[PDB]
Amino acid sequence: LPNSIDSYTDRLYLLWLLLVTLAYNWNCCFIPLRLVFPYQTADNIHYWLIADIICDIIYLYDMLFIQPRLQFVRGGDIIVDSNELRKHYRTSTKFQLDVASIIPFDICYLFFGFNPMFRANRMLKYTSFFEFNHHLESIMDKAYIYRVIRTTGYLLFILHINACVYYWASNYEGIGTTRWVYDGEGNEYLRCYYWAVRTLITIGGLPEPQTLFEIVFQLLNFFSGVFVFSSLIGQMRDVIGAATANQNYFRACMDDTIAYMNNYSIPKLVQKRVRTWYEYTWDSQRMLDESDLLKTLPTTVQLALAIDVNFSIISKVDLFKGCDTQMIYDMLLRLKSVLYLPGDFVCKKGEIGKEMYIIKHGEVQVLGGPDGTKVLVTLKAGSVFGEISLLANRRTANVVAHGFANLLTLDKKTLQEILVHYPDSERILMKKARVLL
């Protein structure tokens, strides 16, 4: 118990939010059940009062202590002092809702019957419940199973509320009086939950309602069952679609490309080559391209992600050393990752070169023998080729991908644009070209 609990880097704070949502979900699941069912008899009344005292002590201990002891952001800076944060939690609306929640009605419990409707003011902590669900959703690694479990919990809760209201209607009209009502003779909660499933799901097949109150109850229950079934099942289909969105987008792009190649005339070896390109980029990228996802971020965090992965890769190599690290930073910013299928040439001799490449997770080869078949050097992941872009222009040797190579392109326009800013690195790389003739 410190004065500064970090809101997102504290597993003990998340376990405390689990304990306050168990003490909230006890009230929101066992207030109706205790209100309308005969489970709170004279025997187990101290067991129910021990559970209500345990959840009220978790309520009061949380609202007095834990509430004003986390940390938040105000005025641009993070707040760490105790008294200003206490006044911030006091001037929030959340403290007003929590003191509206805990009104200790035990003076009326000792006066006017053991009635859980007096305790039913304690169901006003939806802020703490949705704070728990947002914190567990943003903490959990695969949150699509937790959104489905939350929607299934909402559906079982609305069925539980409808089963309690069905047993209240049977207990108000007299149990077993007509044919519509509950009649007894078994597990009361299970038969009323069977009624709540067969009504709220809108199946039917119940007894037909006879008088006015049960006809208007069956009519309003079926109508709200149509709407809550089509709302929460639509929410279930929406969270499953948001789960399956990445694979569905990839199947849409590969569907349109293969349907276009079948719509026009393209032979089956190029068809097999395009679909094995798509097979390798989903088995090694799990995305279509990186640029659409990366370019919606700001410039310094794009520079941070790219510099962490690809500047660790280019800081393995020391071929571009003795040079400006800020030039390596801006060159790091301006790269595009290109793939190459095994067996084909990225550049042939006699062509114009206008790119530069650094191989990252690949294996390329050069071909400059008696006819461009004998492999001179096999450059593994963390080497460089180019230099026709830097010579200020035909290609020297045949560069071929050996396997499924992955290359980072570097254009001649952007390369000359960055080399006319820094002259010392241009001199050093021109000396590298003069020793690499």
Binding site: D77, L212, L305
Partner: protein, 438 residues
């Protein structure tokens, strides 16, 4: 005298006349089919129908005195208003809904367009558009269920009560003979028919077979309409959370596949959580481009001019440069501990600190020299200048954030377009000339 069709007086008339149209439709088809209503509450329906006649006549007067635009100016020529209203077809509908068994009032239930216009202008006006789409949808399905309930009771009255099985039972008995019992069982029949549940007694004649088949097919199209509509309303209610969570799981799935460093993942995830908890996650210009140019300047001027009058360009009254700057602001927030300008490198922009806490630091370890607060503007060295006492167009120092700082940005060419015909280019030049001395 003329009303304006945008004004709140015409909207209060829209709400005061959307009442008798909804009464007319709902209670009209109840009254014409039940007949216990018509033969028991006759003075109440006469008072309410006289109110509906006099409000339809005042509605004819309002559409004969409404306004409409001609090249951006409304017409005050009342002869032109009355002639244009006579030529359009709403006057022909408005006379056919007022010419004198309520078959006379079946002629009166013809002003359907006004209730749709009220729902449209309330969907524009009010601050709860998803709540009003839920309320509009619920009122539409209640009108369909009520109209089908009265059609079912009229089919039972046309065949004969209690002779068959599928018909409403015999009204001589006092069980199914009260009017509340009649209407509540008939609406129970039509909600079981239209929402495709069908626990009703099955039909025994071929006329009732045909009516139940037509009723089930109208009901299953109404079921499709409310499934797609209510699901689209809940998805558009949670659309911003859905697009933000798709962005969060997209970024998090990308970074956990890349095996990038875990404190950097936690930094960008708390950065996005800061952007959602400050409600800035949707951008400004992508919706102010749907706004026009002068209104974009008017929605942009007040907050950014009040936070730009604190910063140090407020010495003299050159506010045309300030309105050219606040039309060209790029608000971008920064995570704490993140360096904005690393020293001695390239510079493409200038910054305005708005609600942030900044510190010009040393290079290796964080030694705070000066604390830049809200009101200090910085980044002006990366534009054109003399040598002075320093070198060329680079960054002269290290500036990082202490906390979460919101920053306005001013890029190079936007500052050059804003930096004409004004002496504050030279005033910023001498202020940064003093800074590059010291």
């Amino acid at each position: 005298i003329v009303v304006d069709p945008s004004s709140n007086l015409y909207y209060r008339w829209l709400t005061a006349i959307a009442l008798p149209v909804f009464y007319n439709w709902y209670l009209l088809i109840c009254r014409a089919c039940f007949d216990e209503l018509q033969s028991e509450y006759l003075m109440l329906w006469l008072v309410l129908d006289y109110s509906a006649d006099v409000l339809y006549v005042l509605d004819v007067l309002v559409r004969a005195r409404t306004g409409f635009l001609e090249q951006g100016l409304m017409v005050s020529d009342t002869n032109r208003l009355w002639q244009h209203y006579k030529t359009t077809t709403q006057f022909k509908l408005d006379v056919l809904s007022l010419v004198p068994y309520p078959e006379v009032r079946f002629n009166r239930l013809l002003k359907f367009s006004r209730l749709f216009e009220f729902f449209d202008r309330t969907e524009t006006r009010t601050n709860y558009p998803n709540m009003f789409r839920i309320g509009n949808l619920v009122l539409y399905i209640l009108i369909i269920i009520h109209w089908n309930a009265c059609i079912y009771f009229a089919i039972s009255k046309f065949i004969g009560f209690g002779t068959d099985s599928w018909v409403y039972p015999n009204i001589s008995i006092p069980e199914h003979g009260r009017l509340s019992r009649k209407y509540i069982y008939s609406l129970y029949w039509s909600t079981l028919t239209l929402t495709t549940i069908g626990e009703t007694p099955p039909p025994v004649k071929d006329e009732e077979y045909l009516f139940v088949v037509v009723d089930f097919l109208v009901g299953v199209l109404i079921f499709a309409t409310i499934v797609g509509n209510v699901g689209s309303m809940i998805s558009n209610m949670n659309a911003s959370r859905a697009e933000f969570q798709a962005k969060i799981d997209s970024i998090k799935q990308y970074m956990q596949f890349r095996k990038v460093t875990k404190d950097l993942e936690t930094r960008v995830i708390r950065w996005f959580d800061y952007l959602w908890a400050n409600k800035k996650t949707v951008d400004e210009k992508e919706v102010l481009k749907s706004l026009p140019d002068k209104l974009k300047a008017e929605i942009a001027i007040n907050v950014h001019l009040d936070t730009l009058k604190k910063v140090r360009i407020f010495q003299d009254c050159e506010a045309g440069l300030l309105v050219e700057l606040v039309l060209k602001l790029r608000p971008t927030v920064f995570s704490p501990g993140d360096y904005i300008c690393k020293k001695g490198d390239i510079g493409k922009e200038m910054y305005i600190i708005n609600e942030g806490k900044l510190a010009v630091v040393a290079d290796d370890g964080v030694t705070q020299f000066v604390v830049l607060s809200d009101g200090s503007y910085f980044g002006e060295i990366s534009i054109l200048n003399i040598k002075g006492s320093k070198s060329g167009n680079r960054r002269t120092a290290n500036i990082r954030s202490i906390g979460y700082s919101d920053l306005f940005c001013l890029s190079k060419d936007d500052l050059m377009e804003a930096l004409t015909e004004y002496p504050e280019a030279k005033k910023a030049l001498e202020e940064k000339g003093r800074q590059i001395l010291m």
